[PDB]
């Protein structure tokens, strides 16, 4: 079937606070498989997040 087609472009980001663990005093982010995790906190620290 091809009689119509709808636009299906990317997802935006999504939340996953299962990532933000704790490094025994600091909040610790991780990554799925090397995916692109977009990161900073209300305080001043790493401001974009394109990381492991």
């Amino acid at each position: 079937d091809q009689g119509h087609y709808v636009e299906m472009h990317q997802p935006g980001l999504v939340a996953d606070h299962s990532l933000l663990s704790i490094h025994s005093a600091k909040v610790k982010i991780t990554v799925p498989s090397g995916a692109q995790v977009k990161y900073y906190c209300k305080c001043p620290d790493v401001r974009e997040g394109i990381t492991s």
Partner: nanobody
Framework: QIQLVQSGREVKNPGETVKISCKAS????????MLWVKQAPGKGFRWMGL????????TYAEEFKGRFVFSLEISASTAYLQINNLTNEDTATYFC??????????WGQGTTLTVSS
């Protein structure tokens, strides 16, 4: 491999300022920030704060927000501690330290200040 070599020990009369250097060797400065610790003569070890050697933002321990100022000669792999308006009870030894492995892995030699007229 990793060597953090610190400046030598100073004497300063109350009121003065001091800049203690920490020259880093063996790692890429930029991926590991610096811990500044005060081991006071009797009292034991205390965290003074941490500096993001990437952005340059310092965190101060509340005990140290004020007269203490962290900075870095990025370019030369140096981190520095500056204690302004020296108080007599600041005599102690200050260590720079590398934060890595969910803690601190390397400590410097120490720079001892003796505030004294």
């Amino acid at each position: 491999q990793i060597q953090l070599v610190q400046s030598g020990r100073e004497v300063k009369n109350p009121g003065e300022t001091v800049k203690i250097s920490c020259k880093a060797s063996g790692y890429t400065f930029t991926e590991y920030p610096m811990l500044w610790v005060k081991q006071a003569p009797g009292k034991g070890f205390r965290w003074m704060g941490l500096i993001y050697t990437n952005t340059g933002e310092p965190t101060y321990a509340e005990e140290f927000k004020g007269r203490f100022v962290f900075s870095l000669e990025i370019s030369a792999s140096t981190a520095y501690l500056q204690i302004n308006n020296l108080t007599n009870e600041d005599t102690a030894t200050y260590f720079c330290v590398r934060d890595y492995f969910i803690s601190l892995d390397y400590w410097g030699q120490g720079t001892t200040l003796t505030v004294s007229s």
